[PDB]
Amino acid sequence: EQPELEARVKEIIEVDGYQFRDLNDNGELDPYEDWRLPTPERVADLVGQMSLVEKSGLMLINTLNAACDPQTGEFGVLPAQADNYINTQHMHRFVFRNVVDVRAEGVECTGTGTPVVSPAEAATFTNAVQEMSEATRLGIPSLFKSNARNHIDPAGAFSAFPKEAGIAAAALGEQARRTGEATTGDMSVVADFADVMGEEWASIGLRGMYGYMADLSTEPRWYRTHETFTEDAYLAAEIMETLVQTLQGEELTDNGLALSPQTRVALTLKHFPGGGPQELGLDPHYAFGKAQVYPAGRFEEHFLPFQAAIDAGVSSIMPYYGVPVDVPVVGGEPGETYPHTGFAFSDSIVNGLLRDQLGFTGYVNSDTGIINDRAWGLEGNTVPERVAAAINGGTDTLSGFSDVSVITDLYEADLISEERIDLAAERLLEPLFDMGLFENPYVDPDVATATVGADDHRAVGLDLQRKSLVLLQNEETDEGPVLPLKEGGDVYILGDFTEETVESYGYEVTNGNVAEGEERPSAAGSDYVLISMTAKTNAGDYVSDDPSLGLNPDHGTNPSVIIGDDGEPLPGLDGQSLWGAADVCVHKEGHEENPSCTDNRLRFGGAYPWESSILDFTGMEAAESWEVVPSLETIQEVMAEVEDPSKVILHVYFRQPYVLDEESGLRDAGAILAGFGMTDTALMDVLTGAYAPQGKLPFALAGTREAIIEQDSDRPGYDETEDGALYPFGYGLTYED
């Protein structure tokens, strides 16, 4: 019956033999403090006593990182803006972005940066914010969200798993190992991962997530394919279902939300209705990439994973920045299309599709910076006008917006009704009640130390690392298949292999990784060449209003067209404009005089927009804003030096679905693997045969740039291209001894 309580500011009262937190400090048991009552009655009572500004503060969510004190040496103290956000803006939702890890030897507090914090220091920080929250007039608790933390970057003290697509590759591979088929996957793999994450996140007082991503990698030119699970909507739907059930629980409320005190992490699924199908792969963080296009008419396949998570009870939904171009309204009158504005401003999307058509009963969380930076389709509108349009469109909380006074001002100007603010307040407050946070919002920092990165948790991650690896090619030689490796030999390594780790398996290693000013030993005479390679963007020089770049006629024109709902094309988006002409620094269609460029330095990722279709390794080596690592030139020298290329093992990190073009010579390697993030001993354990590979690709790979240029950005695979796929979805070899 009686749930545990903890209070550091307010007092505990007991009534009818039960104890309660007196959060308004009146000395009596209000219904919102009365945990015996159903949540709607607790919310109604709480919303009844809030001032307008306290209600409007709930509609903001902003970065609140732990800081360090240069004079005490303590890490995990409150930042400067904590007092403002909690006490002046009345916020109770925050994004925690610090790396959680143990700092080296010698690290002292200094610099503008975001300090690294241990698990115990992270818990101390979030407790302190909860302490400051309880100290407010009604002592409403706070909720921290974060992006993903448990993935190897090819994190910190959290237990390390492969990237999202590696988890899907492992799930498909274990289905095929049990059934013979690779369709929707073995979801015990996903549940095992989610179980470790939920336990570790909750132990530091991190009870929400910006994620996971249900977006589909149907457009290989989209730089965010690196954080998608799959291109296939039905596998994605099965994964989102399992993530909600495991992270939120299977216990549903009467509203149909999987929210209980058993909820370890409440998910804010992103990015609705699906960020995958970007025109030319250009991303809507950037002005030139506002458009999402659906040439194969698959808009409904893309919100199918969201559908599945909504039914499993997911807490929260984040719309993407994108603009849906000419999309028929689901369940609407004939000839109706969705507005050509960003998703969070469209009542048709957030209230119509998400709530009315799909039945979502939770709250809606904007993506970060839609108001000031990415108010797509609202370029001429003011900031207050943009706030009202997102809130009235169905968006309940604004990520990256700080200023509660703008919402109160919009109320006094009758641009947002108080009935709408009450509705947002209800949706935002209910999960905090249902998750037990009004009763006890604190955590034990020392239990975090014993939980984050536990040995058994790390073991689960290691298993999935080994099961994510996909064997794509393993050529038969006179002495048998290239893989697994034989015992002993001379091994040449290139790329991110640790020499002593490879030596430890009983090989003599020659390291081709030399600095730019030293000569590289030849690979001649090696029994094996281990190359670990990938490609990266190097687009930090991009400037939208620079005639050398964004305004350079030699870079061509942006083919993307978006006709505004007023009848005029969006700036720089008429299909004839220079790439940089869509940036507000160029068009200046707002209220405000020389606006900064939003696209400068492409700081979120992605190549130069004129280079977004160069996904082949040969093209990428020559491209201005792509880089092959190690260089394709060095790789090609090395493969010639060994003379017999079947002695070369390529381990490739397909950050995007890169194209192994025949001109590049990479297909002459004896073995090719796709890796999604592993320790060196996990990969050496598979290469040397202690374990056999079993992963299967959760997206198809193409063989030509033409297939890249021809495929439909909203359709999976390459079956409609002339050249087709090099490797299809669900493909992957093993050792057959």
Report the interface residues with ligand BDP, using CB under 6 A. Answer: 95, 147, 210, 270, 285, 367-368, 399
By CB under 5 A, residue 66 contacts Zn ion: no
Quick note: the x/- pattern for Zn ion over 240-279, rule CB under 5 A, is --------------------------------------xx
Task: Look at residue 210 and give the partner it binds from Zn ion, ligand BDP, none, a contact being a CB closer than 5 to 8 Å depending on partner kind.
Answer: ligand BDP
In whole angstroms, how close is the CB of 210 to ligand BDP at the nearest point? 3
Binding-site member from 42, 90, 271, 647 for Zn ion (CB under 5 A): 90
CA dist., res. 437 & res. 139, Å (int)? 11
> Which CB sits closer to ligand BDP, 595 or 605?
605
> Which CB sits closer to Zn ion, 549 or 672?
549
By CB under 5 A, residue 519 contacts Zn ion: no
In whole angstroms, how close is the CB of 379 to ligand BDP at the nearest point? 19
CA dist., res. 128 & res. 661, Å (int)? 54
> Which CB sits closer to ligand BDP, 210 or 610?
210
Q: What string of DSSP letters covers 475-528?
A: -EETTEES-SPPSS-EEEEESS--HHHHHHTT-EEEE----TTSPPPP-TT-SE
By CB under 5 A, residue 42 contacts Zn ion: no
In whole angstroms, how close is the CB of 96 to Zn ion at the nearest point? 19
Q: Is 561 exposed, middle or buried (0-12, 13-18, 19+ CB in 10 A)?
A: middle
> Which CB sits closer to Zn ion, 239 or 350?
239
In whole angstroms, how close is the CB of 52 to Zn ion at the nearest point? 10
**How far, CA to CA in Å, does 323 sit from each of 121, 561, 681?**
41, 11, 44
Whether the link from the prior residue into 484 is cis, omega within 30° of 0, is: yes
Instruction: Please give the single-letter amino acid code of residue 282.
Output: L
CA dist., res. 314 & res. 312, Å (int)? 6
By CB under 5 A, residue 26 contacts Zn ion: yes
Exposed e or buried b per residue across 263-274, where buried means at least 16 C-beta atoms within 10 angstroms of its C-beta: bbbbbbbbbbbb
- Hey, is 356 helix, strand or coil? helix
> Which CB sits closer to ligand BDP, 54 or 227?
227
CA dist., res. 124 & res. 131, Å (int)? 10
By CB under 5 A, residue 601 contacts Zn ion: no
Sign of CA dihedral 78, 82, 87, 90: negative
In whole angstroms, how close is the CB of 107 to Zn ion at the nearest point? 25
> Which CB sits closer to Zn ion, 90 or 93?
90
> Which CB sits closer to ligand BDP, 95 or 314?
95
In whole angstroms, how close is the CB of 69 to Zn ion at the nearest point? 23
> Which CB sits closer to Zn ion, 285 or 647?
285
CA dist., res. 612 & res. 225, Å (int)? 13
By CB under 5 A, residue 69 contacts Zn ion: no
- Hey, is 47 helix, strand or coil? helix
Q: By CB under 5 A, which span of 217-225, 333-341, 417-425, 614-622 interacts with Zn ion? A: 217-225
CA dist., res. 602 & res. 329, Å (int)? 32
By CB under 5 A, residue 16 contacts Zn ion: yes
In whole angstroms, how close is the CB of 396 to ligand BDP at the nearest point? 16
Task: Look at residue 419 and give the partner it binds from ligand BDP, Zn ion, none, a contact being a CB closer than 5 to 8 Å depending on partner kind.
Answer: none
In whole angstroms, how close is the CB of 654 to ligand BDP at the nearest point? 20
> Which CB sits closer to ligand BDP, 215 or 434?
215
By CB under 5 A, residue 55 contacts Zn ion: no
Task: Look at residue 367 and give the partner it binds from Zn ion, ligand BDP, none, a contact being a CB closer than 5 to 8 Å depending on partner kind.
Answer: ligand BDP
Task: Look at residue 399 and give the partner it binds from Zn ion, ligand BDP, none, a contact being a CB closer than 5 to 8 Å depending on partner kind.
Answer: ligand BDP
Task: Look at residue 218 and give the partner it binds from ligand BDP, Zn ion, none, a contact being a CB closer than 5 to 8 Å depending on partner kind.
Answer: Zn ion
Q: Is 71 exposed, middle or buried (0-12, 13-18, 19+ CB in 10 A)?
A: exposed
Instruction: State the Cα angle at 350 between 347 and 354, rounded to 5°.
Output: 130
Whether the link from the prior residue into 505 is cis, omega within 30° of 0, is: no
Task: Look at residue 546 and give the partner it binds from Zn ion, ligand BDP, none, a contact being a CB closer than 5 to 8 Å depending on partner kind.
Answer: none
Task: Look at residue 184 and give the partner it binds from ligand BDP, Zn ion, none, a contact being a CB closer than 5 to 8 Å depending on partner kind.
Answer: none
Residue nearest to ligand BDP (CB): 210
The backbone region for 722, taken as left when phi is positive above 0, alpha when psi lies in -120 to 50, beta otherwise, is alpha
In whole angstroms, how close is the CB of 712 to ligand BDP at the nearest point? 23
Binding-site member from 20, 21, 24, 341 for Zn ion (CB under 5 A): 24
> Which CB sits closer to Zn ion, 208 or 445?
445
Judged by CB under 5 A, the chain residues 279 through 338 that form the site for Zn ion are: 279, 282, 284, 289, 291
- Hey, is 472 helix, strand or coil? strand
Task: Look at residue 22 and give the partner it binds from ligand BDP, Zn ion, none, a contact being a CB closer than 5 to 8 Å depending on partner kind.
Answer: Zn ion
Binding-site member from 21, 93, 151, 226 for Zn ion (CB under 5 A): 226
Residues in the chain: 737
By CB under 5 A, residue 692 contacts Zn ion: no
Whether the link from the prior residue into 457 is cis, omega within 30° of 0, is: no
Task: Look at residue 3 and give the partner it binds from ligand BDP, Zn ion, none, a contact being a CB closer than 5 to 8 Å depending on partner kind.
Answer: none
Packing angle between helix 404-412 and helix 383-393, nearest 10 degrees? Answer: 80
Tokens representing 559 are: 């083919």
Quick note: the x/- pattern for Zn ion over 469-488, rule CB under 5 A, is -----------x--------
Q: What string of DSSP letters covers 619-667?
A: HHHH-SSEEEES-HHHHHHHHHHTS-GGGEEEEEE-SS--B--GGGSGG
CA dist., res. 229 & res. 468, Å (int)? 12
CA dist., res. 34 & res. 644, Å (int)? 75
What residue ranges bind Zn ion (CB under 5 A)?
A: 16, 22, 24, 26, 30, 54, 90, 218, 226, 278-279, 282, 284, 289, 291, 444, 446, 454, 480, 508, 554, 591, 711-712, 715
